[PDB]
Design a protein around this nucleic acid. Structure first.
Ligand SMILES: [Mg+2]
Ligand SMILES: [Mg+2]
Ligand SMILES: [Mg+2]
Ligand SMILES: [Mg+2]
Ligand SMILES: [Mg+2]
Ligand SMILES: [Mg+2]
Ligand SMILES: [Mg+2]
Ligand SMILES: [Mg+2]
Ligand SMILES: [Mg+2]
Ligand SMILES: [Mg+2]
Ligand SMILES: [Mg+2]
Ligand SMILES: [Mg+2]
Ligand SMILES: [Mg+2]
Ligand SMILES: [Mg+2]
Ligand SMILES: [Mg+2]
Ligand SMILES: [Mg+2]
Ligand SMILES: [Mg+2]
Ligand SMILES: [Mg+2]
Ligand SMILES: [Mg+2]
Ligand SMILES: [Mg+2]
Ligand SMILES: [Mg+2]
Ligand SMILES: [Mg+2]
Ligand SMILES: [Zn+2]
Lengths: 119, 77, 177, 48, 134, 178
RNA sequence: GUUGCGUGGUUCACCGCGGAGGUAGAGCUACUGGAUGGCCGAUGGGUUACUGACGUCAGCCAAACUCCGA
RNA sequence: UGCCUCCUAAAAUGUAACGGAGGCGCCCAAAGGUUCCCUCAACCUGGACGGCAAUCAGGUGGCGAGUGUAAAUGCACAAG
RNA sequence: UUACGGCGGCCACAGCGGCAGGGAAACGCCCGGUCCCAUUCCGAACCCGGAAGCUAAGCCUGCCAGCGCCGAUGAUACUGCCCCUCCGGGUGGAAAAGUAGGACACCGCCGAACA
């Protein structure tokens, strides 16, 4: 199916990038997952696989953002940046999750960069 | 008689193989397995090398393992 | 009715097995319905006698340390040169269970015209419960024209016994000359 | 057919880099941006 | 019997140690010649034994040769010093171990088949015996 | 808005309901794409294909074609890797729809000695293949400004799971069959 | 090998523990080849007694075969 | 007659013979670097020229393809 | 705590396949291409904008050994060291195959309702 082909290809792409990009306790993986509707992001540090911070466009404070999925991605970018600060993290590696860098993913990454989080 | 010396040549033995075995303490830069291709793969703290040499980035103990079929060499600091 | 009395091996190994086979015993293992395998020594001559008769199946009543139990020979390791039994592997039967067993097939009847009838597989695997109503399967051929080979179908399988090996196995082939 | 061609920096004429090239594959005198230690930076290093 | 092609035309001698582990029982026929010692059995020996079988039976039954002489044995030209290269392969040989079944008969008559099989053993560079399908 | 499409939604979808009892509304098959391929072997000689098999489909399909390159080497065909050996177009969407609509309307019934074309040509999953042999099938291309005649081979790839429903939807679209 | 001057248990043996292996053996519908007998059957051959690809059922073989493996 | 690869070579390394097999004395300005994307061969089904085998479509297919060049070790996570 | 969503460990005892069941949030397909970006042609994909529709498929759950996979014990092959003319024997190791069987994975990190 088209959905199966997309899911397999996206897992393939993200495994490809995951060979080289790993993320640790001091500089973790900020991994993205955008659906057609929402974007989630989570900061992984996969030496033990413990997500130290997470954010999404599912909670009402991102739902009620006036604007489109660009804005709902910048919202979640600032959100994950601020709770990365709260967890005590300032430098990460950014994992495209297998999607193209650009669009809402790049908007999230730029928002996370503009307010403290420094990949 | 027949001059059947059509095949009497060979190359030098290149001294391949594992040079530092499991649990053996090594310093950084010290080569662990010199080999052709990636018979072993670089694990954590192990570099690969231009000719697939698998050296140590850091000092510590050599350990061998399996990473999804691929057999790997790593150093635990 | 097929009574056989064994002893438990106090030690197993290369030297122990060789010692047993010089003493005339045969090393063997019982393993069955999830039980811990028993490690024992068959009489030798008696075991080699029991499966001359009542087929090679010859479901045995074993007497292990006084307690009676029912065994069935499953694997038989024979030496290539002496053609004597080196090992036996046996199972257990609880008065009826569909155990798979390999049973010989024989042919009865004569081929009239100038025909070569060849036998390919000595024995078919069948499903059988306890005391074997099934035995060697007879192929009653009347000597038909050598253009009709007989497969596992249209066979003389007895009631209570099923053949699930394959309904495509040829056992006897009929050709010219 | 694969001669050793030297590359000279365009600024200080310093003949720095020697490499090989296929004359027939590229007859023209090729250029690459190489690091020039005399200039302390990358510049064009055309053949001699 | 000649291999129609061989990947390695000059091999080491096949190694004659151990009991045969495969081809130990009679598998196609109901009578078999089984070896009791190691030997290299040449294609000429195999062929001569096969002819001995088939013209002791003259008709009927059939003969299996579950041994194929696909291992080459080389030979230096007749008048030569040692060591100017390996000789050219000229013997084709089967590595038979004690317990290997070399030939099998199917024959309706018992004694004729048995006599044919011994006729073949007398053709072989080996001690062998008649064994049956149990 | 393509009229064949609007009428597709108007009657063919619900006709496929009334004919096949699909349990879910999205089981209904649809033509997923249409692939038109040249398969030109007469380009490996003198390498003429641009204004012959590109500027024709630019007016026929409406989209600039892909030059399908060779993949292996064949001595019997005098072909090597890396030569233009085919020309392909893959049509999706409203423009594919309009292409079939124009084809059935003012293009397909014009081929010489045409009486409907084989319905058995299915591949077993629900895709259909056939061919043509002349450019003048379409008004958009004239004969006083073209070269020698050629033809295109068409796959029509549908979401149908099997041949009966693939053929059913092709018939409902308006493909002739015998 | 000896000998001088240094060093000092670093040598070696045994026990335990951590490791890499592809030999022996074995296996091969796990590859590459070799190769026995059946059964079906593309082809070819003179409608088809001739050929019998590929498969399928069994039994095998290998320094430069290996799914394995001391 | 130097170099490279395999087997001999006896599961570390090394190991001889006028032992068994092959290659090399280059090539590539991209066939290097990097970023991103992709998955092959073969088989089956259908298809104008077109056939067993050119291109196309759909399946099946985890590597039997490919790797500039011998062989080995590798590489499908691709090094393709 | 759930027939839910989220990222890794591991790489078949986990895979593949077959049969059923599942849509609250979510994952998805899905509707479009004025709007960044994209097709060696194609808005198929990638990317963007949406929420009319739907669990048909992906995904999730459960059940199936079917195709595969794992796999003892024992025995044998082989073997270190001894004893001994081999055959052999003692002793310490011990396969491959096959059999009994196992197996339709297991574990780790946040949200929805619940609570
Ligand atoms: Mg070498
Ligand atoms: Mg280099
Ligand atoms: Mg050029
Ligand atoms: Mg064997
Ligand atoms: Mg001195
Ligand atoms: Mg140890
Ligand atoms: Mg070991
Ligand atoms: Mg080897
Ligand atoms: Mg061997
Ligand atoms: Mg083969
Ligand atoms: Mg055959
Ligand atoms: Mg070997
Ligand atoms: Mg060695
Ligand atoms: Mg050694
Ligand atoms: Mg030479
Ligand atoms: Mg490049
Ligand atoms: Mg590549
Ligand atoms: Mg819902
Ligand atoms: Mg679209
Ligand atoms: Mg469903
Ligand atoms: Mg064991
Ligand atoms: Mg085993
Ligand atoms: Zn300069």
């Amino acid at each position: 199916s088209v959905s199966a082909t997309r899911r397999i290809s996206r897992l393939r792409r993200h495994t490809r990038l995951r060979k080289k990009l790993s993320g640790t306790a001091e500089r973790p993986r900020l991994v993205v997952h955008r659906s057609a509707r929402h974007i989630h992001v989570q900061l992984v540090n996969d030496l033990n696989g413990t997500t130290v911070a997470a954010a999404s466009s599912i909670e009402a404070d991102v739902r009620g953002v006036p604007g489109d999925k660009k804005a709902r991605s910048v919202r979640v970018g600032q959100l994950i940046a601020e709770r990365a600060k709260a967890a005590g993290i300032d430098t990460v590696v950014f994992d495209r999750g297998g999607y193209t860098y650009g669009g809402r993913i790049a908007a999230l990454a730029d928002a996370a960069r503009e307010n403290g989080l420094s990949f | 008689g027949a001059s059947s010396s059509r095949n009497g040549r060979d190359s030098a033995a290149q001294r391949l193989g594992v040079k530092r075995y499991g649990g053996q303490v090594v310093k950084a830069g010290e080569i662990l397995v010199r080999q052709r291709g990636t018979k072993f793969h670089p694990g954590v703290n192990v570099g690969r090398g231009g000719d697939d040499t698998l050296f140590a980035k850091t000092a510590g103990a050599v350990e061998f393992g399996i990473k999804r079929g691929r057999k790997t060499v790593s150093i635990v600091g | 009715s097929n009574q056989l009395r064994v002893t438990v091996r106090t030690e197993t190994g290369k030297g122990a097995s060789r010692r047993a086979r010089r003493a005339g015993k045969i090393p063997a293992v019982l393993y069955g319905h999830g039980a811990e395998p028993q490690h024992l020594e068959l009489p030798g001559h008696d075991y080699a006698a029991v499966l001359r008769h009542s087929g090679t199946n010859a479901v045995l009543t074993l007497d292990i340390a006084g307690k009676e139990q029912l065994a069935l020979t499953k694997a038989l390791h024979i030496h290539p040169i002496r053609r004597t039994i080196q090992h036996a592997d046996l199972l257990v039967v609880r008065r009826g269970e569909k155990v798979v067993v390999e049973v010989s097939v024989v042919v009865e009847g004569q081929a009239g015209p100038d025909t070569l009838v060849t036998q390919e597989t000595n024995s078919i695997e069948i499903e059988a419960e306890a005391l074997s109503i099934p035995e060697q399967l007879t192929v009653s051929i009347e000597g038909a024209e050598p253009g009709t080979q007989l497969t596992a179908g249209q066979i003389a399988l007895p009631a209570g016994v099923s053949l699930i090996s394959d309904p495509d196995l040829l056992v006897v082939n009929v050709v010219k000359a | 057919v694969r001669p050793k061609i030297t590359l000279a920096c365009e600024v200080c004429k310093h003949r720095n880099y020697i490499t090989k090239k296929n004359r027939r594959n590229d007859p023209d005198r090729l250029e690459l941006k190489k690091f020039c230690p005399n200039c302390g930076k990358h510049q064009a290093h055309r053949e001699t | 019997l000649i291999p129609r092609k061989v990947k390695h035309r000059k091999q080491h001698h096949p190694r004659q140690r151990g009991i045969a582990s495969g081809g130990t029982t009679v598998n196609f026929g109901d009578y078999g010649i089984q070896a009791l010692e190691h030997a290299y059995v040449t294609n000429r020996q195999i062929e001569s034994a096969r002819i001995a079988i088939n013209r002791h039976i003259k008709r009927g039954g059939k003969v299996w040769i579950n041994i194929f002489p696909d291992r080459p044995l080389t030979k230096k030209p007749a008048e030569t010093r040692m060591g100017s290269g390996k000789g050219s392969p000229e013997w084709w040989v089967a590595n038979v171990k004690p317990g290997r079944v070399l030939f099998e008969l199917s024959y309706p008559n018992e004694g004729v088949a048995r006599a044919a099989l011994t006729r073949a053993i007398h053709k072989l560079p080996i001690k062998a015996r008649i064994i049956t399908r149990e | 808005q393509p009229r064949l499409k609007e009428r597709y939604r108007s009657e063919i979808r619900d006709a496929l309901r009334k004919q096949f009892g699909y349990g879910n509304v999205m089981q209904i098959p649809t033509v997923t794409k249409v692939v038109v391929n040249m398969g030109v072997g007469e380009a490996a000689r003198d390498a003429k294909l641009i204004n012959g098999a590109v500027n024709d489909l630019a007016l026929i399909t409406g989209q600039k074609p892909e030059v399908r390159r060779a993949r292996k080497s064949i001595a019997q065909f005098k072909l090597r890797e890396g030569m233009p050996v085919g020309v392909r177009v893959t049509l999706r969407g409203d423009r594919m729809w309009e292409f079939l609509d124009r084809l059935t309307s003012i293009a397909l019934p014009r081929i010489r000695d045409f009486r409907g074309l084989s319905p058995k040509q299915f591949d077993g999953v629900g895709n259909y293949t056939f061919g043509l042999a002349e450019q003048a099938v379409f008004h958009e291309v004239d004969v006083d400004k073209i070269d020698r005649v050629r033809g295109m081979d068409i796959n029509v790839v549908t979401s149908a799971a099997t041949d009966d429903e693939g053929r059913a939807l092709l018939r409902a679209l308006g493909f002739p069959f015998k």
